[PDB]
Design a binder for this molecule. Structure first.
Ligand SMILES: CC(=O)O[C@H]1C(=O)[C@@]2(C)[C@H]([C@H](OC(=O)c3ccccc3)[C@]3(O)C[C@H](OC(=O)[C@H](O)[C@@H](NC(=O)c4ccccc4)c4ccccc4)C(C)=C1C3(C)C)[C@]1(OC(C)=O)CO[C@@H]1C[C@@H]2O
Ligand SMILES: Nc1nc2c(ncn2[C@@H]2O[C@H](COP(=O)(O)OP(=O)(O)OP(=O)(O)O)[C@@H](O)[C@H]2O)c(=O)[nH]1
Ligand SMILES: Nc1nc2c(ncn2[C@@H]2O[C@H](COP(=O)(O)OP(=O)(O)O)[C@@H](O)[C@H]2O)c(=O)[nH]1
Ligand SMILES: [Mg+2]
Lengths: 433, 354, 440
């Protein structure tokens, strides 16, 4: 039994995790009270992947909620699915990080890390065969970055062989709500590239553009972005919970998408997306899904694939469909857009097909890209970093917590090195003399 | 950045001579060829290396690679490089009983010694000879072990905790709270090496009860100090000479134990693969500009894929000389281990034979 | 008497086994639950043919097979599907993770501690037997479970059952269609065990079967079920000589004697001629000559290779249904006069023939038309090297930079094994080239 432990630290991660549990409970037919009222027996075939059984037939999510402030915890508990969680797993403090990485990692998180790791150990011991971990956290700078990387470091030390997964919202240039984003982003990504095994980049600007252009919404809110991220998260772990003609377990992906250990930053996407106004005019089929899948506007990281080349791609289909159609469509995408794909790799489109589509769709698809452009997402942050590190703009708050200056330089150098390896393989040729 | 690879053959030991033990490795100038013992008559597989050394039989006047000849070939030139001011790295690789200690350390009688005693003795002698009233030399040493991608101290008798690794912006990678003791003569170095080799982590496996489980580094830092009279000493050049003991590559069938043994074997295999990749790309880079000239911008060496290649960043490239020694077991019983050793030795710019 | 053990490893082998056992139960009259009304109604005969089933006292029929896997998701479908009551509950499933498309994980990190149970179950099955003839291992290249566990299991069974034949049926990577990024590594690692231990390893390709489905069956969007049914028909045609009466029967030892000139060239292609839809079943005669000619058409081959770019060195035609030796001899005489079909100078006999009286059985809800006659052609030919050669090219482009190797070395493997496998495949290709050169 492949079962996963879920953690959620910070405000953004907690909100996304709440919507994720909403979506998962809807998929598996779990009421907010924790009881089953679904339709098909297949929902109970692999309920233990995310849930744990409780004596009165009930089901408790295998979730651990973390935050330094109590507001997000109260908001989640005072919510639609607030009562589904285990109260003993609500570990939190009473002093916020104040958008301070040093405060989250070194001073305030050091006191709580023992409690969160004790709860994580209790949850992990009960599992028959643990597969991996999940952790939702934004790189804004508060509880998320600091205590998330602390948790990843501790768990990687404790469980060196179980697959680690994270879902993160990168900073954006046009959408920003705090003044110290680049520092926290660089400091967090140092530990992420050191420790994690898969990280799925998410950008608020891309989600807003998807909302305005593809979904044609008028006044999007955070709920829609959490909905999209939840769709991606559910799509990634579809083959552990339902059967299909071709299974794509998390470790299969870990082998397939990652050529070298450090290039494990991925670009997510979902299809179909119709805007509730052009639903009648669209023909939902595998060729059309593939057309929407490899479109620049449909990716959530705010990067242009046309400004790079793909190292790897994974298309997790869900529904009843022919394998010839999928294979031919992936081959056509390879041949028609050959200039945007790496040459050394003979085939770089992993394929997965599941038998149980979403609740209200005949078929759906999840996209997991790995391309060079992603450099442009990191590169901009580095520029901003220099623009505030040339003068030590706000470092005196971090140094107060006991962080030396050199750590910033180390993290910046690691950023630059990671950018250099994505370009290493991105000019399209490599020969002549 | 030039890489020179050497492979050496050892004599039989007491156990091998006690049993019915043949010789299976043949060497001609620079080409080494193996022949299967349990399936003859197929085709002795052949490889080419930068140096092939025959110390098997005895001082056989005809083509017998003495220890001093290997020293003059590798260690003396790289010691000249170290004295010039640039960095140096030396690797030792091979399975248990393959005879890598016979080359690195050698016999204790100091008549047919290893690379390390000759290198240290010549270093101290040249330091003594040129020590005039102005030029001042300093030598310091340290010893660390890389175990499951964690650095541990071998000289300090504290509890075996994991030290931290940092990147100084100018001095490059380094290790925090690493013990560093000064030396004056080879006797202190020998005592430190004995204590460190006693302190290292080993475990019993299905091939040897005291098989290595971790990589090791003996770093020696050499500092020059000019003493012109004007107003300054001008530290001038700081040259590092590093010695690396590499654990043997492992297959799960040989080490079938579950738990810590499998994890250790996997980490050793990953680290060795990354090290070979880095050395191969380094050799290609050295060959190109030397002959080709295409500054090829800088391409990119994956220097951050492991801790062993990360700590030795300043010695493995930029401007320095690298070398490696692979010991071969001549017995047929260890044919697979020897074949794996040659297969690893094929790295660092494989060349053409026949 | 005449008994074979059918082992299925991985998702591909398990699903082909589902199709195979569906077809066998349909052929023999055994209902899914495993009961057989024919014996109790008649009280005579031997409809419980021992080649695939064992009969208990109560009248049930347990198939002779073990369905090994590492993901519960596939075997649990069988354990709760239509045929839940057919099999022994000893399905040999591993309560752990998958091979993750890693040969090492299948071989010697996760495969261990479960191979003992698989071998013990095979020991019990063979001890129940009295006239065991061979094994039928179903797997597929390109997968960690397939390659690794088939290699380990074949090694153990060769050490334990070295005197018994071991047939293999496998799916090879297509020239362009592929559903994973590490298929060449897995196939190359499978080379060094499929060659030495298996006595005759059969090959199929998905792209060729898709083309067959499109051109003949007129299915524009086929899925894996049709491919599995075609493979099941091929295996049934191969094995029919051991069960039903026939004028010219062929045993497995006869197959190995006729199709294998030298030990290292036991890798023939297989094909089925009358793969025709019901709509086009009319407007045609489907005589012996027509099906025999259709067998040698390049379009009808199930591996993407050109027969015209080589020379046949062995051919074995297994006919089923209303056939007589006169028509077969006439068809072979017709084929021998064609210039395109070129035969080696050292095989003057050329063709082997067998005939059986049992026609093909139509699976309900399938796509193959009812036909009075059918033929399965096995062909040892030199063209297959091309299907190998392209794959090596893929491997080369993936090994000049050590991409994805660290996942394999992190599970107990060295980078020299890749070179060992590459040289073994090169030796196989050179031997195949050597065989076809005309003598003087
Ligand atoms: C015409 C019809 O059938 O109604 C659809 C619908 O109109 C559309 C527009 C839906 C609709 O989605 C949105 O409008 C939307 C807006 C912002 C962010 C996300 C979604 C729908 O809301 C979403 C909803 O989707 C689901 O039920 C999926 O299962 C989805 N979400 C949930 O199950 C869910 C559960 C609890 C609470 C909220 C949502 C899902 C997708 C992947 C993995 C798991 C779940 C459906 C059927 C519709 C509506 C209701 C209008 C779409 O749904 C998705 C995300 O697949 C958006 O584009 C698709 C295409 C559909 O045609
Ligand atoms: N003909 C046919 N081929 C299949 C089928 N299912 C999977 N395949 C092929 O099998 C290949 C994967 O190799 P497998 O050995 O089957 O993978 P697996 O059985 O799931 O084993 P793991 O990789 O360990 O999960 C894919 O490239 C598919 O093309 C099937 O049902 N029919
Ligand atoms: N998608 C999403 N992003 C959010 C939400 N709230 C805040 N953010 C992003 O997160 C960043 C702030 O990080 P935050 O979560 O507040 O840090 P925390 O104090 O650890 O919780 C901002 O730059 C926002 O872009 C939300 O509800 N949804
Ligand atoms: Mg599988």
């Amino acid at each position: 039994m492949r079962e996963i432990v879920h953690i959620q630290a910070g405000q953004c991660g907690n909100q996304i995790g709440a919507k994720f549990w909403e979506v998962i409970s809807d998929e598996h037919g779990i009421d907010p009270t924790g009881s089953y009222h679904g339709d098909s027996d297949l929902q109970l075939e692999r309920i233990n992947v995310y849930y744990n059984e409780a004596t009165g037939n009930k089901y408790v999510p295998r979730a651990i909620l973390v935050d330094l402030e109590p507001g997000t915890m109260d908001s989640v508990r005072s919510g639609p699915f607030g009562q589904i969680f285990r109260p003993d797993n609500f570990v939190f403090g009473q002093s916020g990080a104040g958008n301070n990485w040093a405060k989250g990692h070194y001073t305030e998180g050091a006191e709580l890390v023992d409690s969160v790791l004790d709860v994580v150990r209790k949850e992990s011991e009960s599992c028959d065969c643990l597969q991996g971990f999940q952790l939702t956290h934004s790189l804004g700078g508060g509880t998320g970055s600091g205590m998330g990387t602390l948790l990843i470091s501790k768990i990687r030390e404790e469980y060196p062989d179980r697959i680690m997964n994270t879902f993160s919202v990168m900073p954006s240039p046009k959408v920003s709500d705090t003044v110290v984003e680049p520092y926290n982003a660089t400091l967090s990504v140092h530990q992420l590239v050191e420790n994690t095994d898969e990280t799925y980049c998410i950008d608020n600007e891309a989600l807003y553009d998807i909302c305005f252009r593809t979904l044609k919404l008028t006044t999007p809110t955070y709920g829609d972005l959490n909905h999209l991220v939840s769709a991606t998260m559910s799509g990634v772990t579809t083959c552990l919970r339902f059967p299909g003609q071709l299974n794509a377990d998390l470790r299969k992906l870990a082998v397939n998408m990652v050529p070298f250990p450090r290039l494990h930053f991925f670009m997510p996407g979902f299809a179909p997306l119709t805007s509730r106004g052009s639903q009648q005019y669209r023909a939902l089929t595998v060729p059309e899904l593939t057309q929407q899948m490899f479109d620049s506007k449909n990716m959530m990281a705010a990067c242009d694939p046309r400004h790079g080349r793909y190292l790897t791609v994974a298309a997790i289909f869900r529904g009843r469909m022919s394998m010839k159609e999928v294979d031919e469509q992936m081959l056509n995408v390879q041949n028609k857009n050959s200039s945007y794909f790496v040459e050394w790799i003979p085939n770089n489109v992993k394929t997965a097909v599941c038998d149980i589509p979403p609740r209200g769709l005949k078929m759906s698809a999840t996209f997991i890209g790995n391309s060079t452009a992603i450099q442009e997402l990191f590169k901009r942050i580095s520029e901003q970093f220099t623009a505030m590190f040339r003068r030590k703009a706000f470092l005196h708050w971090y140094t107060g917590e006991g962080m030396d200056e050199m750590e910033f330089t180390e993290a910046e150098s690691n950023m630059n090195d990671l950018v250099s390896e994505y370009q290493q393989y991105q000019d399209a040729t490599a020969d002549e003399q | 950045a030039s890489v020179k690879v050497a492979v050496r053959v050892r004599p039989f030991n007491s156990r091998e001579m006690s049993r019915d033990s043949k010789c299976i490795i043949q060497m001609s100038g620079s080409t080494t060829t193996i022949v299967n013992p349990k399936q003859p008559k197929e085709t002795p597989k052949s490889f080419s290396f930068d140096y092939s050394y025959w110390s098997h039989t005895s001082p056989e006047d005809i083509n017998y690679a003495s220890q001093k000849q290997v020293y003059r070939d590798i260690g003396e030139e790289m010691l000249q490089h170290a004295f010039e001011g640039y960095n140096v790295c030396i690797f030792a690789y091979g399975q248990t009983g393959a005879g890598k200690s016979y080359t690195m350390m050698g016999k204790q009688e100091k008549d047919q010694q290893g690379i390390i005693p000759q290198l240290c003795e010549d270093l101290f002698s040249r330091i003594n000879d040129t020590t005039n009233d102005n030029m001042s030399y300093s030598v310091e040493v340290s010893y660390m072990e890389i175990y499951c991608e964690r650095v541990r101290d071998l000289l300090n008798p504290k509890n075996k905790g994991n030290l931290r690794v940092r990147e100084h912006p100018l001095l490059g990678p380094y290790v925090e709270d690493l013990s560093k003791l000064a030396v004056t003569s080879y006797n202190d170095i020998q005592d430190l090496m004995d204590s460190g080799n006693k302190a290292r982590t080993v475990a019993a496996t299905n091939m040897n009860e005291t098989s290595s489980r971790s990589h090791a580094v003996f770093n020696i830092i050499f500092t020059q100090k000019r003493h012109d009279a004007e107003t300054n000493i001008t530290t001038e050049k700081v040259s590092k000479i590093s010695l690396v003991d590499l654990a043997g590559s492992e297959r799960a069938d040989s080490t079938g134990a579950k738990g810590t043994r499998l994890k250790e074997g996997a980490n050793i295999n990953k680290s060795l693969t990354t090290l070979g990749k880095v050395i191969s790309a380094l050799a290609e880079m050295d060959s190109g500009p030397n002959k080709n000239k295409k500054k090829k911008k800088t391409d990119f060496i994956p220097y951050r894929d492991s801790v062993l290649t990360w700590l030795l960043r300043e010695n493995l490239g930029g401007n320095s000389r690298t070398a490696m020694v692979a010991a071969l077991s001549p017995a047929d019983i260890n044919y697979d281990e020897t074949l794996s050793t040659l297969r690893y030795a094929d790295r660092a710019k494989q060349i053409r034979c026949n | 008497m005449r008994e074979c053990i059918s082992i299925h490893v991985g998702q591909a082998g398990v699903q082909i086994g589902n199709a195979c056992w569906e077809l066998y139960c349909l052929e023999h009259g055994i209902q899914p639950d495993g009961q057989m009304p024919s014996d109790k109604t008649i009280g005579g005969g031997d409809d419980s043919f021992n080649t695939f089933f064992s009969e208990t006292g109560a009248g049930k029929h347990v198939p002779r097979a073990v369905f090994v896997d590492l993901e519960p998701t596939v075997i649990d479908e069988v354990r709760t599907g239509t045929y839940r009551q057919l099999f022994h509950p000893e399905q040999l499933i591993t309560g752990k993770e998958d091979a993750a498309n890693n040969y090492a994980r299948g071989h010697y990190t996760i495969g261990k501690e479960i191979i003992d149970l698989v071998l013990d179950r095979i020991r019990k099955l063979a001890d129940q037997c009295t006239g065991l003839q061979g094994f039928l291992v179903f797997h597929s290249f390109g997968g960690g479970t397939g390659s690794g566990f088939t290699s380990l299991l074949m090694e153990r069974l060769s050490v334990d059952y070295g005197k018994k034949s071991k047939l293999e049926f496998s799916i090879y990577p297509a020239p362009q269609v592929s559903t994973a990024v590490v298929e060449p590594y897995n196939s190359i690692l499978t080379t060094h065990t499929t060659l030495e231990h298996s006595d005759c390893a059969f090959m199929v390709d998905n792209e060729a079967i898709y083309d067959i489905c499109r051109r003949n069956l007129d299915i524009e969007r086929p899925t894996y079920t049709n491919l599995n049914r075609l493979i099941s028909q091929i295996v049934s045609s191969i094995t029919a000589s051991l069960r039903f009466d026939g004028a010219l029967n062929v045993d497995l030892t006869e197959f190995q004697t006729n199709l294998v000139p030298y030990p290292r060239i036991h890798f023939p292609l297989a094909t089925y001629a009358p793969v025709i839809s019901a709509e086009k079943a009319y407007h045609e005669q489907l005589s012996v000559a027509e099906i025999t000619n259709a067998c040698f058409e390049p379009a009808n081959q199930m591996v993407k290779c050109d027969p015209r770019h080589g020379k046949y060195m062995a051919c074995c035609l297994l006919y089923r249904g209303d056939v007589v030796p006169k028509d077969v001899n006439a068809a072979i005489a017709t084929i021998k006069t064609k210039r395109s079909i070129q035969f080696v100078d050292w095989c003057p006999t050329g063709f082997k023939v067998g005939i059986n009286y049992q026609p093909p059985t139509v699976v309900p809800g399938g796509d193959l038309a009812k036909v009075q006659r059918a033929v399965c052609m096995l062909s040892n030919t030199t063209a297959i090297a091309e299907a190998w050669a392209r794959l090596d090219h893929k491997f080369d482009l993936m090994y000049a930079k050590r991409a994805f190797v660290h996942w394999y070395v992190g599970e107990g493997m060295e980078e020299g094994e890749f070179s060992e496998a590459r040289e073994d495949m090169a030796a196989l290709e050179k031997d195949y080239e050597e065989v076809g050169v005309d003598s003087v």
